Design a protein around this ligand. Structure first.
Ligand SMILES: O=C(O)CNC(=O)C(=O)O
Ligand SMILES: [Mg+2]
Ligand code: NI
Ligand SMILES: [Zn+2]
Length: 331
């Protein structure tokens, strides 16, 4: 078995190997990359997502989210308080202000220490889940707005034609902005490109060990657990690497820098934070190996997790028994 210790793998495709996205994902899995739950892909040096980022300031962040923490430094939840719209220019200025900017630090490790020590005492503002793309339409390779759709994958593998569309989302981050512990909707893959700015640190649990994370989470967030049998779908819970080590949960960590892709694999729980002002683009996708994970994915039916139009069809076709109760949650 390749990669038996489930380490995060880093790939350096050639321009030639960067032509066929599906085939490269399949290559990565042949080498065991999925075992980690997360891989890094460094694009060939000839590749570019677009010519420059000089003209992005007029993008609107219609609902910036202030991420308010509760709990203790290593075990907390966050809630998203909606703030007034601002442009990316305004947001960048805010991220760079004395109140919100990244503190002086030695290196990534020192900054990680500072994050876990101090995150709870601040409420950074995140521009998340903004429909859109920063890839130039002329970028032919690994353009997250030109991937094959999940609906087409399901049609190709299973023969059923369904409604729904699949488009990318932009994330504008600042110091301490945080993504809670989650897998993707319907345990899909995701791909994330860091277009610009400061890094993003990721933590990940191997898919084969995801249930160990869930068991810990139920112990650490006991009222949330009683409220919903899939409360990590709410995307609000954080657990530090110290806490995970104390409880024997297998995980890995890696820092993504501007110009790099990360791929999360089905049922790979991940969480992380941004180091300073940045912009990422991400999208879910499927492969044939995903199907069985989609069939088995947990669902939130308490009604908090409230998810896309397109997830309806996935649940309807892959989880017909759940369909009924899940849609009661969605309506
Ligand atoms: O970048 C972020 O804030 C969150 N991204 C993801 O969880 C992802 O790409 O799967
Ligand atoms: Mg603009
Ligand atoms: Ni994710
Ligand atoms: Zn729920």
């Amino acid at each position: 078995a390749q990669n038996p210790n489930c380490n995060i793998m880093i790939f350096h495709p050639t321009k030639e190997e960067f032509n066929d996205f599906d085939k490269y994902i399949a290559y990565m899995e042949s080498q065991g990359a999925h075992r980690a739950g997360l891989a890094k892909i460094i694009p060939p040096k000839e590749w570019k997502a677009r010519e420059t980022y000089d003209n992005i300031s007029e993008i609107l962040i219609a609902t910036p989210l202030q991420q308010v923490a509760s709990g203790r430094a290593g075990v907390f939840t966050q809630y998203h308080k909606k703030k007034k719209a601002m442009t990316v220019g305004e947001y960048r200025h805010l991220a760079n202000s004395k109140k919100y900017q990244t503190p002086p630090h030695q290196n990534f490790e020192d900054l990680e220490r500072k994050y876990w020590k101090n995150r709870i005492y601040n409420s950074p503002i995140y521009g998340a889940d903004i429909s859109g793309s920063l890839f130039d339409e002329n970028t032919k390779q690994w353009n997250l707005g030109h991937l094959g759709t999940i609906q087409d994958l399901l049609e190709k593998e299973c023969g059923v034609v369904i409604e729904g569309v699949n488009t990318p989302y932009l994330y504008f981050g600042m110091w301490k902005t945080t993504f809670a512990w989650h897998t993707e909707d319907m345990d899909l893959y995701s791909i994330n490109y860091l277009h610009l700015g400061e890094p993003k640190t990721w933590y990940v649990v191997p898919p084969e060990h995801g249930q160990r994370l869930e068991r810990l989470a139920r112990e650490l967030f006991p009222g949330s657990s009683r409220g919903c049998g899939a409360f990590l779908r709410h995307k609000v819970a954080l657990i530090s690497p110290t806490v995970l080590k104390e409880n024997g949960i297998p995980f890995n960590r890696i820092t993504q820098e501007a110009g790099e892709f990360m791929v999360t694999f089905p049922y790979g729980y991940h969480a992380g934070f941004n180091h300073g002002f940045n912009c990422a683009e991400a999208i879910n996708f499927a492969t044939p190996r995903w199907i069985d994970y989609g069939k088995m994915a947990s669902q939130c039916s308490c009604g908090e997790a409230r998810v896309t139009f397109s997830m309806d069809a996935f649940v309807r076709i892959l989880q017909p028994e759940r369909y009924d109760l899940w849609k009661r949650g969605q309506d």
